[PDB]
Design a protein around this ligand. Structure first.
Ligand SMILES: *[C@@H]1O[C@H](CO)[C@@H](O[C@@H]2O[C@H](CO)[C@@H](O[C@H]3O[C@H](CO)[C@@H](O)[C@H](O)[C@@H]3O)[C@H](O)[C@H]2NC(C)=O)[C@H](O)[C@H]1NC(C)=O
Ligand SMILES: *[C@@H]1O[C@H](CO)[C@@H](O[C@@H]2O[C@H](CO)[C@@H](O[C@H]3O[C@H](CO)[C@@H](O)[C@H](O)[C@@H]3O)[C@H](O)[C@H]2NC(C)=O)[C@H](O)[C@H]1NC(C)=O
Ligand SMILES: *[C@@H]1O[C@H](CO)[C@@H](O[C@@H]2O[C@H](CO)[C@@H](O[C@H]3O[C@H](CO)[C@@H](O)[C@H](O)[C@@H]3O)[C@H](O)[C@H]2NC(C)=O)[C@H](O)[C@H]1NC(C)=O
Ligand SMILES: *[C@@H]1O[C@H](CO[C@@H]2O[C@@H](C)[C@@H](O)[C@@H](O)[C@@H]2O)[C@@H](O[C@@H]2O[C@H](CO)[C@@H](O)[C@H](O)[C@H]2NC(C)=O)[C@H](O)[C@H]1NC(C)=O
Ligand SMILES: *[C@@H]1O[C@H](CO)[C@@H](O[C@@H]2O[C@H](CO)[C@@H](O)[C@H](O)[C@H]2NC(C)=O)[C@H](O)[C@H]1NC(C)=O
Ligand SMILES: *[C@@H]1O[C@H](CO)[C@@H](O[C@@H]2O[C@H](CO)[C@@H](O)[C@H](O)[C@H]2NC(C)=O)[C@H](O)[C@H]1NC(C)=O
Ligand SMILES: *[C@@H]1O[C@H](CO)[C@@H](O[C@@H]2O[C@H](CO)[C@@H](O)[C@H](O)[C@H]2NC(C)=O)[C@H](O)[C@H]1NC(C)=O
Ligand SMILES: *[C@@H]1O[C@H](CO)[C@@H](O)[C@H](O)[C@H]1NC(C)=O
Ligand SMILES: *[C@@H]1O[C@H](CO)[C@@H](O)[C@H](O)[C@H]1NC(C)=O
Ligand SMILES: *[C@@H]1O[C@H](CO)[C@@H](O)[C@H](O)[C@H]1NC(C)=O
Ligand SMILES: *[C@@H]1O[C@H](CO)[C@@H](O)[C@H](O)[C@H]1NC(C)=O
Lengths: 240, 320, 40, 46
């Protein structure tokens, strides 16, 4: 388990070393803030119909009545440029808030604890995650237990022994072909079916697909060996 | 989950067939490109939102031909090979109920691109998700799919709500009969009314209305002598025409900035809905919610996705 | 001999599941896997 | 034995320690042995 984890962290350094696209979202946000700034700058150059883009030149050619017309184009167009960029930015910001609020919830549920939500803390059953800082962002190193070598087995919902019906307390009942066992639902480790592994309800008539086997009782040979202890004190007590 | 991929030629929507208007529009410049970048942003986003909700598994699971699912009769929500498009039964009810203006927009340099995923591809991901859920329980989400007998899955679910697995098996008939009875009402409901789908219809009707309203702003004078560009250009020369055109460019450009601002904002609503739906898939469909009411009222057992026009339906199953 | 092609996207590999009314699969082994997830 | 469960042998667990583990069934039977032995002994008597 430790070796697989060490092997996986190795692959993270390798992955981040190998591809350009990994930090995609963060590199995207930076590109969008810079592109929007340069777009805002570039509207300063636009004439809007005024005889120049350069505000002093206009003063140098027109009086207070005609400069007011030409300048009011640049003010109206420019003010429309700031009202545009700030709208795009208030919207952009609203995307980032939803991202941040998820990232806060993931910090709480994937770092300060272990989530049961499926695929919420990366693909596979969650074990833990390690947070890492980035330019304007966070990276989570999610650690999961992914099933890897499955094998086919026969199963039955329940077992009949004393003509009562029996169920796993936790786990499932499975046959290797020749013998029935009980095991945990998420890793193969078969066990002898016993009273302690199981619980009982009703007779064998209602449960569809129920099968017949023994149930072993760990009290029983502890009393059988105590019956054979008892008989040996009787045979000895026949001797005197 | 998504909406129409609008695309507009801003030059088309401001300056349709005028070079005079084109030269005047260059006095403003990048506003035309900038809006197209914004609409292109939302248009590419639809393929993300639709991948995020449906493409949660990268392998195409399929049903066995035999249907020994303990009496649970999914045939109403699984695909139908007899159909010209392979959706289920319940998905045709969804497609039949949600609804010249579309040509009038087309003449004005407005366009609607098709989504990357065809509605059959959406039915195909849905088929894999649903068949996976039945044949394999949650296990196909967390790793390679492990088969399980359907009543053994249902026992796990019952234990997931702390109800004991014998309480399933001791009533398996009543449970399957109620599951079948409930899907019978899902059909009867979705066949009868259309009001339950009103969330999707209201999303279409807003997007369609915003395109109608943006179209209807072309027929506006804005205080120029005509609402029609050409009727100015026909009547006035290069001194006078420009002043009446510069008003229509201004009024129209303001009318576009407005529609795009509305649509970026609207698209933030749909993205919240996409993220919620992706989570609802990831937790109710690929899992079992311990979250209360998050997968419908009652204790969560399991949920089945069904495709819908630009959206998704979850059929949540609950113990009550 | 490389060229730009066009195709309907195959959504993945096809896989009919080994379902039966009495069949289960169980992992005898597992991988501990780590992923990155990046957030703004 | 009821608070715990059992698997494997002493080699595999890094840092496993030694102690008794109680069995509640043990003196519950052993007192039944003292009860039995008192019957055995009395049956020597007659
Ligand atoms: C299914 O699992 C069964 C339990 O692991 C297994 O049965 C066991 O088979 C071994 C031999 O492979 C037997 O080993 C014993 O054989 C005799 C018993 O008198 C002794 O000489 C040996 O020392 C050893 O104790 C087990 O007795 C037997 N267990 C049981 C409960 O019968 C099956 O072989 C497995 N089936 C398949 C298809 O592999
Ligand atoms: C699983 O094991 C059960 C115990 O062996 C077995 O039950 C037994 O089945 C037979 C046939 O149904 C019964 O046979 C008797 O039936 C009546 C009396 O009730 C007589 O008319 C017959 O001549 C015959 O004697 C056994 O009495 C019955 N015993 C019990 C406790 O069930 C199941 O049939 C087995 N099932 C499978 C699938 O193997
Ligand atoms: C926990 O209890 C264990 C069982 O008593 C105990 O294992 C025993 O430890 C001693 C000392 O390490 C070993 O002593 C013998 O070691 C070799 C033969 O194996 C000889 O060269 C020595 O002379 C000596 O006889 C026992 O063999 C060993 N028994 C077993 C079954 O492994 C652990 O040491 C105890 N651990 C703690 C921390 O209490
Ligand atoms: C899991 O089982 C399926 C089929 O179920 C078993 O198949 C028989 C061979 C036998 O074991 C029966 O008791 C079961 O019903 C396997 O599917 C087979 O796969 C091979 C290719 O590997 C193919 O040639 C066969 O036609 C398939 N048969 C069926 C019925 O699908 C599957 O491979 C098994 N998986 C593992 C990991 O063992
Ligand atoms: C599952 O439910 C469907 C719907 O009732 C059943 O299919 C119908 O079966 C009857 C009897 O053969 C026919 O009259 C209908 O035309 C069928 N409809 C469809 C859509 O196929 C199906 O038989 C049920 N399966 C089980 C195992 O009960
Ligand atoms: C639990 O409630 C169910 C109904 O939800 C009962 O099932 C019905 O029982 C009557 C007879 O009492 C039958 O006529 C119906 O046809 C049954 N319906 C179904 C769908 O099976 C059930 O009897 C109740 N059980 C208990 C123990 O109260
Ligand atoms: C479980 O899987 C791991 C690999 O993921 C197995 O470990 C390998 O075991 C073989 C020998 O069988 C060695 O050659 C490899 O070098 C091992 N790799 C590691 C990381 O140790 C492990 O043995 C498997 N367990 C079982 C029960 O099969
Ligand atoms: C399982 O399927 C077989 C056919 O392959 C059928 O004959 C049998 O009765 C079924 N058993 C159960 C418990 O469903
Ligand atoms: C038999 O019982 C006597 C006491 O009555 C005792 O001394 C002796 O050790 C016992 N022998 C065996 C083999 O149990
Ligand atoms: C615990 O740490 C000490 C060193 O401080 C070491 O000697 C001991 O063997 C360690 N035991 C385990 C189980 O790691
Ligand atoms: C013998 O044992 C019985 C109890 O079973 C007791 O009542 C009786 O007093 C005993 N007699 C002697 C002589 O020990």
């Amino acid at each position: 388990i430790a070796n697989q984890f060490n092997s996986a962290i190795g692959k993270i350094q390798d992955s981040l070393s190998s591809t350009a696209s990994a930090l995609g979202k963060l590199q995207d946000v930076v590109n969008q803030n810079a592109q929007a700034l340069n777009t805002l700058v570039k509207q300063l150059s636009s004439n809007f119909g005024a005889i120049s883009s350069v505000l002093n030149d206009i003063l140098s050619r027109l009086d207070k009545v005609e400069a007011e017309v030409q300048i009011d184009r640049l003010i109206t167009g420019r003010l429309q440029s700031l009202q545009t960029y700030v709208t795009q930015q208030l919207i952009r910001a609203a995307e980032i808030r939803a991202s941040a609020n998820l990232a806060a919830i993931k910090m709480s549920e994937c770092v300060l604890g272990q989530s049961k939500r499926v695929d919420f803390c990366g693909k596979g059953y969650h074990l833990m995650s390690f947070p890492q800082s980035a330019p304007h962002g966070v990276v989570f190193l999610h650690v999961t237990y992914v099933p890897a070598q499955e094998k086919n087995f026969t199963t039955a919902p329940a077992i009949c022994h004393d003509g009562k019906a029996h169920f796993p307390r936790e786990g499932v009942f499975v046959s290797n072909g020749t013998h029935w066992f009980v095991t945990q639902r998420n890793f193969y480790e078969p066990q002898i079916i016993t009273t302690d592994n199981t619980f009982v309800s009703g007779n064998c008539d209602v449960v569809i697909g129920i099968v017949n086997n023994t149930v072993y009782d760990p009290l029983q040979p502890e009393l059988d060996s105590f019956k054979e202890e008892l008989d040996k004190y009787f045979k000895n007590h026949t001797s005197p | 989950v998504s909406m129409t991929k609008t695309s507009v030629d801003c030059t088309m929507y401001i300056c349709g067939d005028s070079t005079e208007c084109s030269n005047l529009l260059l006095q403003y410049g990048s506003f035309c490109t900038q809006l197209n970048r914004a609409l292109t942003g939302i248009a590419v986003e639809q393929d993300k939102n639709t991948q995020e909700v449906f493409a949660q598994v990268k392998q195409i699971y399929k049903t066995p031909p035999i249907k020994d699912f303990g009496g649970f009769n999914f045939s109403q929500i699984l695909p139908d090979p007899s159909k010209p498009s392979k959706r289920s039964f319940i998905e045709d009810l969804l497609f039949n109920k949600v609804t010249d203006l579309i040509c009038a927009q087309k003449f004005n340099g407005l366009t609607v691109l098709p989504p990357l995923l065809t509605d059959e591809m959406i039915a195909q991901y849905t088929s894999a998700l649903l068949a996976g859920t039945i044949t394999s329980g949650w296990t196909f989400g967390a790793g390679a799919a492990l088969q399980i007998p359907f009543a053994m899955q249902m026992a796990y679910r019952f234990n997931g709500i702390g109800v004991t697995q014998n309480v399933l098996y001791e009533n398996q008939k009543l449970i399957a009969n109620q599951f079948n009875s409930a899907i019978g009402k899902i059909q009867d409901s979705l066949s009868s009314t259309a009001s339950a789908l009103g969330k999707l219809q209201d999303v279409v009707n807003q997007n369609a209305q915003a395109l109608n309203t943006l179209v209807k702003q072309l027929s506006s004078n804005f205080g120029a002598i005509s609402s029609v560009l050409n009727d100015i250009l026909s009547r006035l020369d290069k001194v006078e025409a420009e002043v009446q055109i510069d008003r229509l460019i201004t009024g129209r450009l303001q009318s576009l900035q407005t529609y795009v601002t509305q649509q970026l904002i609207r698209a933030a609503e749909i993205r919240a809905s996409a993220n919620l739906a992706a989570i609802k898939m990831s937790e109710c469909v690929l899992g079992q919610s311990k979250r209360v009411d998050f997968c419908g009222k009652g204790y969560h057992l399991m949920s089945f996705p069904q495709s819908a026009p630009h959206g998704v339906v979850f059929l949540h199953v609950t113990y009550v | 001999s490389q060229s730009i092609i066009a195709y309907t996207m195959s959504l993945g590999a096809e896989n009919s599941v080994a379902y039966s009314n009495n069949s289960i699969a169980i992992p005898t082994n597992f991988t501990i896997s780590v992923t990155t997830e990046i957030l703004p």
